[PDB]
């Protein structure tokens, strides 16, 4: 019955639409804009948590922690390019190996 | 242990962990002093000091990486002040 | 302050990809910052895209090109495919 479930999204399309209004990014916001944006946010969240979940399994840990997010991001060329100017709190460095 | 290996052993140890490496209270005192020069009787939310330490240490670590590349470029292993001055000048921080 | 967070939705997405694993509260706050940052960067680019064209409205066209500007390489191709799929299934529903 939610707008999210008509798109098939987990992320809140209504929340995104409200934020697009609150931020006064433009005079108008189209009906498709928040669905598209929520879908893109969901995709990027899933891809991050996928790689952090792999990194958590490889380290034999049950919880994903900032170390695993840092490993996942920095090992991927594209996520590392998206987050190149970003510092992750309690992240280490990549070891030289 | 082979002679002189311990430096590389330290390199392994500190790269593997995620700890903050500066003592917390000294860095807090430094932040307090610098802020006090801008504006007297400021207060700091403790997470503000933690965020400022995390950004500071991440900045210093990346600067030492660039400095070590400058040292290697000079066919040299000891990092020298002029390596830091080169890294900072190339990365645009001579300001 | 009833602070807005994505945590319950990050959890729901997490349980689609790694249902066996959990997520630390700190890593959750990092994911929350990540989602906010990517949202603000896409909305900002879509804003100046609209202004450059002298249009008053932000549509799926603006979000799509803001994604193609902001995201590198194949990450863009898949994000755009996901967005157009979601907009299609929404438009073919109530």
């Amino acid at each position: 019955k939610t707008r999210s479930s008509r798109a098939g999204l987990q992320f809140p399309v209504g929340r995104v639409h409200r934020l697009l209004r609150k931020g006064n990014y433009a005079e108008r916001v189209g009906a498709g804009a928040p669905v598209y944006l929520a879908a893109v946010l969901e995709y990027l969240t899933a891809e991050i948590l996928e790689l952090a979940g792999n990194a958590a399994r490889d380290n034999k840990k049950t919880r994903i922690i900032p170390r695993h997010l840092q490993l996942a991001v920095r090992n991927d060329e594209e996520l590392n390019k998206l987050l190149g100017r970003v510092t992750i709190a309690q992240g280490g460095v990549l070891p030289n190996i | 242990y082979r002679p002189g290996t311990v430096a590389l052993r330290e390199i392994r140890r500190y790269q593997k962990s995620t700890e903050l490496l500066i003592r917390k209270l000294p860095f807090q005192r430094l932040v307090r002093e610098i802020a006090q020069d801008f504006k007297t009787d400021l207060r700091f939310q403790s997470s503000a000091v933690m965020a400022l330490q995390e950004a500071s240490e991440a900045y210093l670590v990346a600067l030492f990486e660039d400095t070590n590349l400058c040292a290697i470029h000079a066919k040299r292993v000891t990092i020298m002040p002029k390596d830091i001055q080169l890294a900072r000048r190339i990365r645009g921080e001579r300001a | 302050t009833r602070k807005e967070s994505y945590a319950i939705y990050v959890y729901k997405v997490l349980k689609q990809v790694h249902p066996d694993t959990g997520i630390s509260s700190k890593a959750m706050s990092i994911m929350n910052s990540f989602v906010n940052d990517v949202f603000e960067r896409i909305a900002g680019e879509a804003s100046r895209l609209a202004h450059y064209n002298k249009r008053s409205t932000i549509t799926s066209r603006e979000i799509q090109t803001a994604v193609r500007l902001l995201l590198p390489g194949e990450l863009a191709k898949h994000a755009v495919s996901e967005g157009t799929k979601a907009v299609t299934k929404y438009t073919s529903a109530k």
């Binding site: 380290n59 695993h68 490993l71 | 052993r9 | 997405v13």
Partner: peptide, 24 residues
């Protein structure tokens, strides 16, 4: 395993565990 990403990623090993037997 309900959701997967089609990205043509290379494989990666994330294990940080290490030893010093080559320093010994």
């Amino acid at each position: 395993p309900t959701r997967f990403s089609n990205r043509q990623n290379k494989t990666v090993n994330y294990n940080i565990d290490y030893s010093d037997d080559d320093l010994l």
